[PDB]
Each structure stands twice: as structure tokens, then as C-alpha cells.
Design an enzyme around this catalytic site. Structure first.
Site, short mmCIF file in Angstrom:
data_model
loop_
_atom_site.label_atom_id
_atom_site.label_comp_id
_atom_site.label_asym_id
_atom_site.label_seq_id
_atom_site.Cartn_x
_atom_site.Cartn_y
_atom_site.Cartn_z
N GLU A 124 0.82 -1.21 0.00
CA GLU A 124 0.00 0.00 0.00
C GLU A 124 0.86 1.26 0.00
OE1 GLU A 124 -2.60 -0.03 3.31
OE2 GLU A 124 -4.09 1.34 2.46
N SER A 178 -10.89 5.26 6.00
CA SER A 178 -11.69 4.89 7.16
C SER A 178 -11.06 5.41 8.44
CB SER A 178 -11.85 3.37 7.23
OG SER A 178 -12.32 2.84 6.00
N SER A 181 -3.73 7.28 8.08
CA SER A 181 -2.32 6.89 8.04
C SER A 181 -1.48 8.11 7.71
CB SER A 181 -2.07 5.79 7.00
OG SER A 181 -2.65 4.56 7.41
N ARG A 193 5.76 4.91 7.23
CA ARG A 193 4.52 5.25 7.91
C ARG A 193 4.88 5.73 9.32
NH1 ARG A 193 0.12 3.32 11.23
NH2 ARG A 193 -1.92 3.72 10.26
N1 LIG Z 1 -19.47 7.43 -1.58
C1 LIG Z 1 -18.88 7.25 -0.33
N2 LIG Z 1 -19.21 6.23 0.45
C2 LIG Z 1 -18.62 6.11 1.62
N3 LIG Z 1 -17.71 6.92 2.11
C3 LIG Z 1 -17.33 7.97 1.38
C4 LIG Z 1 -17.91 8.17 0.12
N4 LIG Z 1 -17.37 9.28 -0.43
C5 LIG Z 1 -16.48 9.78 0.43
N5 LIG Z 1 -16.45 9.00 1.55
C6 LIG Z 1 -15.56 9.23 2.69
O1 LIG Z 1 -14.34 8.58 2.35
C7 LIG Z 1 -13.95 7.71 3.42
C8 LIG Z 1 -13.24 6.49 2.84
O2 LIG Z 1 -12.15 6.99 2.07
P1 LIG Z 1 -11.14 5.98 1.35
O3 LIG Z 1 -9.82 6.70 1.07
O4 LIG Z 1 -11.75 5.44 0.06
O5 LIG Z 1 -10.91 4.81 2.41
P2 LIG Z 1 -10.64 3.24 2.34
O6 LIG Z 1 -9.50 3.03 1.45
O7 LIG Z 1 -11.92 2.57 1.78
N6 LIG Z 1 -10.36 2.78 3.87
P3 LIG Z 1 -8.88 2.27 4.36
O8 LIG Z 1 -8.86 0.72 4.34
O9 LIG Z 1 -8.72 2.69 5.75
O10 LIG Z 1 -7.69 2.79 3.49
C9 LIG Z 1 -15.24 7.31 4.15
O11 LIG Z 1 -14.90 7.03 5.51
C10 LIG Z 1 -16.07 8.60 4.03
O12 LIG Z 1 -15.76 9.50 5.11
O1 LIG Z 2 -2.28 3.68 12.96
C1 LIG Z 2 -3.06 3.40 13.81
C2 LIG Z 2 -4.57 3.30 13.52
C3 LIG Z 2 -4.79 2.87 12.06
C4 LIG Z 2 -5.31 3.78 11.13
C5 LIG Z 2 -5.50 3.36 9.81
C6 LIG Z 2 -5.17 2.06 9.44
C7 LIG Z 2 -5.39 1.61 7.98
C8 LIG Z 2 -6.09 0.33 7.53
C9 LIG Z 2 -4.67 0.62 7.05
C10 LIG Z 2 -4.65 1.16 10.37
C11 LIG Z 2 -4.46 1.57 11.69
F1 LIG Z 2 -3.96 0.72 12.63
N1 LIG Z 2 -2.59 3.12 15.17
C12 LIG Z 2 -1.24 3.20 15.56
C13 LIG Z 2 -1.10 4.40 16.51
N2 LIG Z 2 -2.12 4.36 17.63
C14 LIG Z 2 -1.81 4.68 19.01
N3 LIG Z 2 -0.67 5.20 19.47
C15 LIG Z 2 -0.82 5.35 20.85
N4 LIG Z 2 0.00 5.82 21.83
C16 LIG Z 2 -0.38 5.86 23.10
C17 LIG Z 2 -1.66 5.43 23.47
F2 LIG Z 2 -2.05 5.47 24.78
C18 LIG Z 2 -2.54 4.94 22.51
C19 LIG Z 2 -2.09 4.91 21.16
O2 LIG Z 2 -2.66 4.51 20.00
C20 LIG Z 2 -3.50 3.95 17.22
C21 LIG Z 2 -3.46 2.78 16.24
MG LIG Z 3 -7.51 3.34 1.53
#
Ligand SMILES: Nc1ncnc2c1ncn2[C@@H]1O[C@H](COP(=O)(O)OP(=O)(O)NP(=O)(O)O)[C@@H](O)[C@H]1O
Ligand SMILES: O=C(Cc1ccc(C2CC2)cc1F)N1CCN(c2nc3ncc(F)cc3o2)CC1
Ligand SMILES: [Mg+2]
Ligand SMILES: Nc1ncnc2c1ncn2[C@@H]1O[C@H](COP(=O)(O)OP(=O)(O)NP(=O)(O)O)[C@@H](O)[C@H]1O
Ligand SMILES: O=C(Cc1ccc(C2CC2)cc1F)N1CCN(c2nc3ncc(F)cc3o2)CC1
Ligand SMILES: [Mg+2]
EC number: 2.7.1.33
Lengths: 355, 355
Positions: A124, A178, A181, A193
Site C-alpha cells: 500500500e 476509514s 495513516s 509510515r
Molecule cells: N461514496 C462514499 N461512500 C462512503 N464513504 C465515502 C464516500 N465518499 C467519500 N467517503 C468518505 O471517504 C472515506 C473512505 O475513504 P477511502 O480513502 O476510500 O478509504 P478506504 O481506502 O476505503 N479505507 P482504508 O482501508 O482505511 O484505506 C469514508 O470514511 C467517508 O468519510
Molecule cells: O495507525 C493506527 C490506527 C490505524 C489507522 C489506519 C489504518 C489503515 C487500515 C490501514 C490502520 C491503523 F492501525 N494506530 C497506531 C497508533 N495508535 C496509538 N498510538 C498510541 N499511543 C499511546 C496510546 F495510549 C494509545 C495509542 O494509540 C492507534 C493505532
Molecule cells: Mg484506503
């Protein structure tokens, strides 16, 4: 094989499709009817089934890719509907699929129900960075891919303006999907990251639906546009009676998100629109604040925001632009990209020569 | 004058009261009946009216202060009920009041409705730091004021254990009230407010009440203790099908707080207890994550959490202890203080010799 890149996220599947436009007479003859049917279906429709959408305004026209000229198309649909997508593929036969996102792992076995389909799961981070640098390099049909909001402090002057990324390093990339990152990009081959936060776009949409009953991201934004977040939030002036200038905190700064909702009479008077706006403001300010802290730690002053949380979401973009500039005393600049939801899908497509 | 210190916050008023225990026969005679009535009323009751509470277990006994021996009492009531407090004062006459918190400014004119009362507004930062260092210096009746949760990773071993703060610098203080203030303390006279976040205790209580209908902080915690936050949150394993070990993200990490609530069928099956726990987890993890980023930026490894969000809140304390240790790879240590809600009120009391 048709040239696809796919980013299967937790919420949305993003697909980049290269439509060749230099097809010769001989190549057209040696083309399978199923491939002609797919290319026709994709280029003749802007809505696919009930939930698929082609973002026609993002199309890159007459792009040279892998020695061919074509159009790059950008298509999205809900991850919940991926079974329909896979079942369409099994009906029409299939193909080497470069795929990224969490769903490339989670649904690997499902993609392989399509006979002889080879799925190549791509990292990714490599896909996001490669696709971001690629799209900015080729331009958005001669226009800048990257932009900022100039004079974000004054609304009668705030306007979208282009930003040059020819020397893009270093760069802090804030991927709001969602969750969130946060990536530090030091070179085309040196990136990491930094961290992330779970308060992202899914938090906005999930909390919004719980609090207001909205049934779509778009409806949540429409509600927020009509609301007043200060009906739910407690501001610095609610606690101090004005500014807290000992620490430079203006009276309008939010001291406690949803903090006025500890009072039952205020919960009974707040509107859904107010709660939608407070949800948007809470999530957006938290993302911006975490981005600022990471930029300070990484010693990076260019912060670019991507993902689909900001799609058709000017409120959050302008809030990020104003707030990042204000709280950084002008040391950090909020940047945005026209193809912000699709870079992983493009970067996956760009991995095709490796296979 | 009776010796008081007051911290008027956005949500709670905290009061520290020094009860002299070395009163001589002559001093007892030269005592006003109103002062005897107040001292009797405060020391003979643990509940004051309908909303005031004396935290008897926090009392410091036989403390030497300003050349006198006495007991230090710790009393709290809702800021919403400060008009009742002020009206009690106007009924019984009054007195030099050292006060801090936002309410010392907001309600300054109200305190001066008590004839000849002198209100001295003291800086919240000086009061918090001075009161924290003072209480740890005198000890909690011979016991440690500061503690941590040892072996927070394994529940069958996790236990509260004392921590020495004789050389307390540097120290990162995370004040979780309605919102969150983050302080860097480098010496007894060199400290600053690093930043803050609006996702604090008022966010937990406000969102909890909106989502569950709970009518008190205690009920919100009772609901959360019975809930499963993973019914509302989307985890790393929901997106990837397992761990995301490329970036060391375990499958149980929360990827999107409330992220599963974008699905209507899941909103209809989630319980109030699940939503209360997800609210608690969301707020607590965000506080811990912001504390970690600030500790890294400030180059401070001791992070102490104060405020009243953590009062009778072992869930959030243990979550902070485990999560700060885990995500910092053991470089940061979460610390807690027995008198965590009252340091501003004590520091205000300690300013009395200046007037
Ligand atoms: N048509 C839609 N449906 C749902 N969510 C939408 C839509 N358009 C915009 N969004 C927003 O876009 C966000 C998702 O963005 P996106 O970058 O596509 O995430 P993702 O790749 O599906 N999730 P992740 O696995 O965390 O990378 C949702 O949480 C909503 O806040
Ligand atoms: O990146 C994340 C959350 C996250 C976001 C998006 C994705 C995408 C699907 C790919 C995956 C993930 F996992 N996390 C790491 C940092 N984190 C944290 N750091 C802390 N330090 C002290 C504390 F007391 C509590 C703490 O929580 C929270 C979880
Ligand atoms: Mg995504
Ligand atoms: N009895 C209670 N009533 C209300 N909130 C409580 C209570 N007990 C604990 N809390 C929690 O404690 C938080 C307030 O903590 P506190 O440190 O007293 O803040 P404050 O000083 O009133 N606000 P601030 O102006 O931001 O400093 C609330 O947001 C709740 O999460
Ligand atoms: O301390 C706070 C919040 C706060 C908490 C508690 C109190 C207590 C009553 C005393 C007062 C407060 F004001 N704030 C400063 C940092 N902040 C921020 N930084 C950003 N950076 C980039 C962005 F895009 C957005 C950003 O928002 C948010 C407001
Ligand atoms: Mg306070």
C-alpha cells in the site's frame, strides 16, 4: 489483458483503468468480444450497476503509459459490493490483477475464484507514493495536480490556487480513509509510515449516522453544511468568558468537542445539522492537529492530505487549510490533490511491468 | 479567614480546604460563630446539598501548612451549581479567595457579590504545577502520591505500584478535564503548555449521553464496563483479515473508531453498552496517542495523567498504561496521581501568602 489497478479499502474500492486509444485495425480484429464488451461497457457508462461510479472529471486524456497512448479512468464502488464485482468477472471470463489495500489480502481467495486470474498484492505504501508522484509528474491534463487554499484566514479572499511539486521531498502525506495513516516521504525510495489515528472518515460517517440518521456520506455533508457546531461544542469562551490569552488560545477555539452535550437541555435543543457539523469539525481538527505534531517531529513543512474523506468536502478542506496555518503560525502549509482518492489504485497499475 | 483554594473548571469546581487542628482555647473563643458553623458543616458532612461531595479518602491528615497543623480536605461539585455555592456565601457573610480555572475569570463578578470578598485569580499553569509538586512532596499520608500499572500487558499480573518523583523533571503532564491540556515541566519555574486537544472528558460524557441516554459520568462508565467496543469499531483485522505486519500493526488495533457504524444493520444491533465502551476507547486512545507524540517532540519519557476524566475510571487508566507502553516500545511510562483532580485547587491555596 486490460490494464487495471485496484485499491480495495475498508470502505471503497478504487479502480484505475487505462483505455487504449491507439488501437490499430489489426489489433481491433485480434480482440476478444468479451474485451470489447468490457471496454465499451466501461467507456459508455458513468454509473455501473446501482453503486459503481466513474469520476469522469478526473480522467487523464491522451496519456502515454507502457508505450501506448490512452485515457486513464477513475472508478469507485463500495467494498460491500465487491461480491457483485467478482461475480460479474466470473460471468464474462478473466487477466493479471495488481491490487493493493487491505482487501487485496482479505479477498485474495475470492479473486482467485476467477479461473486463471493472477492476483499480485502490492504494498500500500509503495502504491500510494508511486501513484501520487506519477500523477503529479504527468499533470492533470496540463493543470496542476496539487493545490492549496490561498489566504485561508479571510473568507472573501480564500481561493483554490495551484502548488508546484516538482521537487516534492520531503513531504508529509496524510491519508484520510476509514482511519488515518501518516507517511513521511523523504525520497522516491525512502518513505515510512510515521503513525496513524483511528479517528478518520469512518468515524465521521459512523458517528454522523448514529447521531442524525443520515444514510450517506453526501447527506452527512449536506447536514453539516447547515449546522452550527458551537451548539454542541464547548468553546474557550464558554469556560473563560473570553480569550485565554496567557496561552494564546482564542475564545472561538474548541475546548471540548461535544462538551455542551453533557447538559440534558442542550441535548434536547440541538439539531441533527448541528451534530453533523460538530462531528465534521471534531474529526477534521483532530486530523489536522495530529498532522501538525507529526510534521513538527519529522521536520517537514509540506503536509498533503489524500483519501476520500475530503471528496466533495470543501468544508473540511478549508478548515484544514485555515487551522493548519493558524496553529502552526504559518510554518505548515496544507496541500490537496485532485486525484486524492485514487493514488493507491494508480500505483498498483504502475506495478504491472513487474509481472 | 478560612484557608481555601478553588479551581472552577468548565464542568467541576474543586475546592481544597485546610481544617486547623491545633486550635488553642483562646483561638477557639476569638472565633466567629459563622466560622465555627462552616468548619462544623464541612467536617461533619460528606455530602453538601444535593451535588457537593467531600472525597474523604483523599484527606491529608496532620499536614503542616503556613506554620499551622491541620487536615487538608478535597471537595467537588458541579460548576452548574456555583450559583448555589455563592448564595450560601451571601447568606452567611464573607475572606480572601484564591481561585484558578476558567471560572475564576468568568464568574469574577459573581464572587464579588459577596461583600468585601477579595478574589485573586491565579494562573492555572502555576497552580497545577505547584499543587502537583507540593502534594507529591508531602506524600499521601506517608504513601506515594504517584503510581503506575506494572506489567500492564498481562492482566493476571497488572497491578498498581508506587512511583518515586523526588527528581520530577522533566515531566509531561496530561490534564484531562473537559478537553485536554498538555504541559511540559522542565523545572519548578520552567514549564509551558505544549498544546491541547478538544477530545477530552466532556467529549466522552457528551457523546456517551447522546448515544446511550446515560445521565451521569458514573452511569457512562458502568455501561462501558459491560460493552464490547469492537462491535462499533473497525479493527485492522476487519480490513486486512489479520495483522498488517509490514508496519507492525496488530490485528486488534483500531483502524476506524465507530467505523463499523457506517452499516445500518450494525447500527441496529449494537448495544448502548458497546457504544459507551467504544466512546471510552476512542477518547482514551486519542489522548494517549497525542501524549505520545508530544512526549517524543519534547524528549520527555515520563507522562503523568491528571484531571477527573480518570476518577473512578480504571478502564481508561489501564488502557493508557498498556497502550502507551505498547506503542512507545516501552520508551514511555504512564503515571497517575492519587489527587489527580485537585492540583489546581491546592496550588491556588498555596498562593495565599502572596496576599
Ligand atoms: N461514496 C462514499 N461512500 C462512503 N464513504 C465515502 C464516500 N465518499 C467519500 N467517503 C468518505 O471517504 C472515506 C473512505 O475513504 P477511502 O480513502 O476510500 O478509504 P478506504 O481506502 O476505503 N479505507 P482504508 O482501508 O482505511 O484505506 C469514508 O470514511 C467517508 O468519510
Ligand atoms: O495507525 C493506527 C490506527 C490505524 C489507522 C489506519 C489504518 C489503515 C487500515 C490501514 C490502520 C491503523 F492501525 N494506530 C497506531 C497508533 N495508535 C496509538 N498510538 C498510541 N499511543 C499511546 C496510546 F495510549 C494509545 C495509542 O494509540 C492507534 C493505532
Ligand atoms: Mg484506503
Ligand atoms: N461527577 C462528575 N461529573 C461530571 N464529570 C465527571 C464527574 N466525575 C468525573 N468526571 C469526568 O471528569 C471530567 C471533568 O474533569 P475536570 O478535571 O474536573 O475538568 P474541568 O476542570 O471541570 N474542565 P476544564 O475547564 O477543561 O479544566 C468530565 O468531563 C468527566 O469526563
Ligand atoms: O488546546 C486546544 C484545545 C483546548 C483544550 C482544553 C482547553 C482548556 C480550557 C482550558 C482549552 C483548549 F483550547 N487547542 C489548541 C490546539 N488545537 C489544534 N491544533 C491544530 N493544528 C492543525 C489543525 F488543522 C487543527 C488544530 O487544532 C486545538 C485547540
Ligand atoms: Mg480543570
Amino acid at each position: 489483458s486490460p490494464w487495471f489497478g485496484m485499491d480495495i479499502g475498508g470502505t471503497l474500492v478504487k479502480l484505475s483503468y487505462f483505455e487504449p486509444i491507439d488501437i490499430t485495425a489489426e489489433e481491433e480484429q485480434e480482440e476478444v468480444e468479451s474485451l470489447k464488451s468490457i471496454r465499451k461497457y466501461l467507456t459508455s457508462n458513468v454509473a455501473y450497476g446501482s453503486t459503481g461510479i466513474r469520476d469522469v472529471h478526473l480522467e487523464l486524456k491522451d496519456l502515454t503509459l507502457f508505450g501506448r497512448r490512452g485515457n486513464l479512468h477513475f472508478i469507485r464502488f463500495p467494498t460491500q459490493d465487491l461480491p457483485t464485482f467478482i461475480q460479474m468477472g466470473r460471468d464474462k471470463n478473466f487477466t493479471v490483477l495488481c491490487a493493493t489495500g487491505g482487501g487485496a489480502y482479505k479477498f485474495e481467495k475470492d479473486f482467485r475464484t476467477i479461473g486463471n486470474l493472477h492476483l499480485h498484492k502490492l504494498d500500500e505504501l509503495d502504491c500510494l507514493v508511486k501513484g501520487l508522484l506519477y500523477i503529479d509528474s504527468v499533470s492533470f491534463n496540463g493543470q496542476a495536480e496539487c493545490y492549496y487554499f490561498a489566504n485561508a484566514s479571510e473568507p472573501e479572499r480564500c481561493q483554490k490556487m495551484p502548488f508546484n511539486l516538482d521537487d516534492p521531498y520531503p513531504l508529509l502525506v496524510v491519508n484520510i480513509g476509514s482511519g488515518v495513516s501518516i507517511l513521511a516521504v523523504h525520497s522516491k525510495d525512502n518513505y515510512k509510515r510515521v503513525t496513524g489515528t483511528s479517528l478518520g472518515g469512518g468515524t465521521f460517517l459512523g458517528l454522523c449516522s448514529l447521531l442524525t440518521g443520515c444514510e450517506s456520506f453526501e447527506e452527512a455533508l449536506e447536514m453539516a453544511s447547515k449546522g452550527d457546531s458551537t451548539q454542541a461544542d464547548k468553546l474557550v469562551r464558554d469556560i473563560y468568558g473570553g480569550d485565554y490569552e496567557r496561552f494564546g488560545l482564542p475564545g472561538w477555539a474548541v475546548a471540548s468537542s461535544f462538551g455542551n452535550m453533557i447538559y440534558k437541555e442542550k441535548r434536547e435543543s440541538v439539531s441533527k445539522e448541528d451534530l453533523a457539523r460538530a462531528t465534521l469539525v471534531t474529526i477534521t481538527n483532530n486530523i489536522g492537529s495530529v498532522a501538525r505534531m507529526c510534521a513538527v517531529n519529522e521536520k517537514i513543512n509540506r503536509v498533503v492530505f489524500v483519501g476520500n474523506f475530503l471528496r466533495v468536502n470543501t468544508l473540511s478542506m478549508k478548515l484544514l487549510a485555515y487551522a493548519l496555518d493558524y496553529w502552526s503560525k504559518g510554518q505548515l502549509k496544507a496541500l490537496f490533490l485532485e486525484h486524492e482518492g485514487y493514488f493507491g489504485a494508480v500505483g498498483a497499475l504502475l506495478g504491472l511491468p513487474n509481472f
